[PDB]
């Protein structure tokens, strides 16, 4: 309920006036001016499911976190800071999963992107070397080569920061690192871009 209040302050529940057929299951109503609204319960269930997918991997440094959007850059360096995932902040360089001579080349087991139209090169390249992917998806998202969507508002900084903060909290809960049923010492403000 407290996290619901936080989701309401960040407005993580508002879409972008267009709807795809595969996101139709996550919609609840439509605002008059055309904006769509997500069912927040479904959003939380996708967050929990993604957390339960992340913890199967023994070493977290082989999870890739890719986010080209400036408004998310800060938020992705903190998700790693408490989970020990591997961040690819800026322009994704072609070849990073397919070309072994590259200096930042790697062979991860999960790709976690922020947006499916930004960061398209990572999503397309991961389909050549057997990586599944999880994406933060808005109402107009195209789910090609994506296995788990997360319905959410992926433009405003508060939304993005709170989303990565929730994900990292539930992962640290599931692994046993931080205690269950108790507010994390980390304020979500550390994830939002100033």
């Amino acid at each position: 309920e407290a996290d619901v209040k936080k989701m309401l302050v960040a407005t993580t529940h508002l879409g972008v006036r267009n709807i795809d057929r595969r996101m139709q299951f996550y919609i609840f109503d439509r605002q008059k001016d055309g904006t769509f609204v997500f069912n927040l319960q479904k959003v939380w269930a996708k967050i929990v499911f993604a957390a339960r997918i992340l913890v199967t991997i023994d070493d977290p440094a082989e999870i890739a976190v890719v986010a080209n959007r400036p408004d998310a850059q800060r938020a992705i360096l903190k998700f790693c800071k408490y989970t020990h995932a591997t961040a690819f902040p800026g322009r994704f360089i072609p070849g990073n999963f397919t070309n072994r001579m590259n200096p930042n080349y790697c062979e991860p087991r999960l790709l976690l992107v922020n947006d499916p139209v930004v960061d398209r090169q990572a999503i397309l390249e991961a389909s050549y070397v057997n990586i599944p992917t999880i994406s933060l998806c808005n109402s107009d998202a195209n789910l090609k080569f994506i296995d788990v969507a997360i319905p959410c508002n992926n433009k405003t900084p508060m939304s993005i920061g709170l989303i990565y903060w929730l994900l990292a909290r539930e992962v640290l809960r599931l692994k046993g690192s931080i205690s269950r049923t108790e507010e994390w010492d980390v304020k979500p403000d550390l994830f939002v871009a100033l």
């Binding site: 619901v4 960040a10 529940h13 319960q41 800060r74 508060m158 304020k187």
Partner: protein, 101 residues
Amino acid sequence: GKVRTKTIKRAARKIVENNYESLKPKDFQNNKAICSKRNVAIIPSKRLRNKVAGYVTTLMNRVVKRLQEEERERRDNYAPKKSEFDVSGATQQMIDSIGFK
């Protein structure tokens, strides 16, 4: 009509990054600074050295307008004393259709 080749520039950047403390933005001191072999720099000619120092002096008076990486890190970790989250027609219909409200 005097464009510096990549060879001048690539050496000038490592010189400015390694020896930030030594280089004032005035040229004679940097001319000496592109001479020492303790700040190790093997410049095989004096015209070449002068061109590199001419670009180094210019790199110096552009960073004024490492000391800018200690503070950038030391400002990415500050949590204020607030929390930054302390009207609806269709979401109300969604909180009624979920929980207490």
